[PDB]
A and B are shown apart, each in its own frame.
Chain A
């Protein structure tokens, strides 16, 4: 996260840290006690599927304070339409091997209904994006969880306000952020939440997905449009686990 601030400990309680062989991989969002929403591109280079861990209640990477809860990722569900190395349908649904325990420091973010998200949440201008990604383009990643308030743009406006072989902004994406190079989410924030506040409650509206460098002038951050996947997610959360970590599920 570039140009944000430290998220005060416990104020981002749905933030997930994904680890592979103990190394920082991506962010994610807890949506109930056993399910995590992340980005499909986070898993393009994974070979050690059995060494994937989700950490809830994390804040400071340098210290163990007792609020952290680690779980093995039992399943990674990706839409059939996602193509590795590309941008479209950038979403993954992760089943934890054992549920996390809800506490003051571990709380799910609401996964909204599609209608509510399209009709109402899509028009809330500002939303928060968070993660332990790069503090600067070509810079070090954060030791403390960072958060940034970003405004959402209509895709016509994102296409007109952008500068520059760049991918298209599909109906499964939306732009958010700034074109002046001061504030953005970065590659190390991939998979993390874009959370929207409405009438005293926070909801999942986007996933940190892609962009150019980090906080690059003339470029906005691009986020997976979660509203397109509500039905796809709900159906999978009602399904029985299958042998093997990676599962490709038909989309729609």
Chain B
């Protein structure tokens, strides 16, 4: 599942025993209830540009 379109995950993807898939996020992010989206939990999450984000 993870090999194809990143398993639908916004960030990280783990394949499980069967047709199961778990999305995960980098530190400074938490996974939303959709099980795919990553939202920042910190003021300066990695890979995001504050001057562009605040625009």
Contact = CB atoms under 8 A, between A and B. Distances in A.
A56 B4 CA distance: 37
A107 interface: yes
A113 interface: yes
Contact of B12 (A10, A13, A107, A116): A116
B39 to A, nearest CB: 11
Interface residues of A, number: 28
Nearest to B42: A102
A104 B11 contact: no
Contacts of A115: 2, 12-13
B37 to A, nearest CB: 9
Given A115-B2, A116-B6, A119-B6, A110 B46 contact: yes
A21 to B, nearest CB: 31
Contacts of B49: 10-11, 13, 107, 202
Contact of B50 (A31, A107, A111, A116): A107
> What are the 5 A-B residue pairs with the smallest beta carbon separation, nearest first?
A102-B44, A202-B47, A110-B47, A110-B46, A201-B47
Interface of A: 8, 10-11, 13-14, 31-32, 102-113, 115-116, 119-120, 199-203
